[PDB]
Amino acid sequence: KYTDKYDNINLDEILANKRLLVAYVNCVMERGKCSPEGKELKEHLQDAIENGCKKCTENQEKGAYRVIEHLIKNEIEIWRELTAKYDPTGNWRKKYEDRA
Ligand SMILES: OCCCCCCCCCCCCBr
Ligand SMILES: OCCCCCCCCCCCCBr
Ligand SMILES: OCCCCCCCCCCCCBr
């Protein structure tokens, strides 16, 4: 499994604060520096997409759905950029949008 050492991160505060959210977005989109957490996400995001979170902790799976639903509803443009870069064949795009 991926490490659980950052699993207590406060996702609600990241989603509530645009400056914070965009810092992570810029890290993963390679246009900004990465915090230790952001870096750990950037290094495992493609793998997780390729195997449907096979190595994710329960908290990470829960967290992913939370963040993805927020991006789809409130930052559609950021969702489009992320899904296109990290999921180019669209393995999960329609699935998450349908759930959202
Ligand atoms: O232990 C799980 C690590 C995840 C920490 C980073 C969460 C950042 C959520 C914001 C992402 C926005 C799109 Br990049
Ligand atoms: O279908 C799965 C795609 C959702 C993206 C999973 C995010 C990966 C979380 C891994 C945790 C990295 C440690 Br910070
Ligand atoms: O089509 C799939 C694209 C998935 C992009 C996911 C980015 C957000 C993942 C945040 C993970 C938080 C773990 Br706590």
Phi-psi region of 90 (alpha: psi -120 to 50; beta: other; left: phi over 0): left
- The answer to whether the CB of 60 is under 6 A from ligand 3 is yes
How far is the centre of ligand 2, averaged over its atoms, from the C-alpha of 85 (Å)?
14
How far is the centre of ligand 3, averaged over its atoms, from the C-alpha of 81 (Å)?
12
DSSP string for the chain: ----TTTT--HHHHHH-HHHHHHHHHHHTTSS---HHHHHHHHHHHHHHHTTTTT--HHHHHHHHHHHHHHHHH-HHHHHHHHHHH-TT-SSHHHHHHH-
The method recorded for this entry reads X-ray
How many Cα neighbours within 13 Å face the side chain of 69?
11
Asked if 40 and 34 touch (Cβ cutoff 8 Å), the reply is: no
How far is the centre of ligand 1, averaged over its atoms, from the C-alpha of 22 (Å)?
11
Q: State the residue range of the domain holding 89.
A: 1-100
- Based on the structure, what is the number of domains in the chain? 1
Asked if 97 and 72 touch (Cβ cutoff 8 Å), the reply is: yes
The CATH code of the domain that includes 1 is: 1.10.2080.10
Please report the resolution in angstroms. Answer: 1.8
